[PDB]
Amino acid sequence: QEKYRLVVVGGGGVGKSALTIQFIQSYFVTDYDPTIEDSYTKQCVIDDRAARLDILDTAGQEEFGAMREQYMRTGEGFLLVFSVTDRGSFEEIYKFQRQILRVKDRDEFPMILIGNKADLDHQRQVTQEEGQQLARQLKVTYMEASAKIRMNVDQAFHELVRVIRKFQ
Ligand SMILES: Nc1nc2c(ncn2[C@@H]2O[C@H](COP(=O)(O)OP(=O)(O)NP(=O)(O)O)[C@@H](O)[C@H]2O)c(=O)[nH]1
Numbered sequence: 001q002e003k004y005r006l007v008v009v010g011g012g013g014v015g016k017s018a019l020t021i022q023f024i025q026s027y028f029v030t031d032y033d034p035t036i037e038d039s040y041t042k043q044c045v046i047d048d049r050a051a052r053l054d055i056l057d058t059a060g061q062e063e064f065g066a067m068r069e070q071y072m073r074t075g076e077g078f079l080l081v082f083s084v085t086d087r088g089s090f091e092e093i094y095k096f097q098r099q100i101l102r103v104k105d106r107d108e109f110p111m112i113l114i115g116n117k118a119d120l121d122h123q124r125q126v127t128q129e130e131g132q133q134l135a136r137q138l139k140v141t142y143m144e145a146s147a148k149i150r151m152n153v154d155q156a157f158h159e160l161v162r163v164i165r166k167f168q
């Protein structure tokens, strides 16, 4: 009888939807269809403790920036996603962290930094050490993922739940 409202945020095209669809439906989307805001649910067992995960897949497009206050108010944990092949998305993810903490009026709040598209090994603009450094700056953990090859997809969501449980 436990549930978590998880929210996937980050800049446009970094793979928020591809990660979420791989997690929910176990298939990889090739087309890039920009999201306004989509919702999904999954029943999981994390550390032998069952939990329903209600996932909000949000807009990376600035056009829909005004919807952030609403979803940031109600989110219980956030996956901060950037693409390792897009340095702009890497430099911009801190803006999402700042807005979450401003809406929560808190110095810390459950989050994890995800460097997606790690399968694009020959196209990287951000090294693994750079992502780990940014995570330390933001006081969160770092995980690299690939929606394409389904690397660390379930793990990213499970780990966010673990972080949320430690904040309680
Ligand atoms: N090689 C590779 N491509 C990926 C990966 N994740 C997403 N992509 C791709 O990158 C594009 C955008 O992915 P998408 O999930 O729609 O990104 P998004 O962050 O939801 N975009 P938006 O903010 O506009 O909703 C796609 O064409 C998709 O196939 C990945 O892990 N590896």
Ligand SMILES: [Mg+2]
Pocket (backbone or CB within 6 Å): 016, 017, 018, 033, 034, 035, 057, 058, 059, 060
């Ligand atoms: Mg999307």
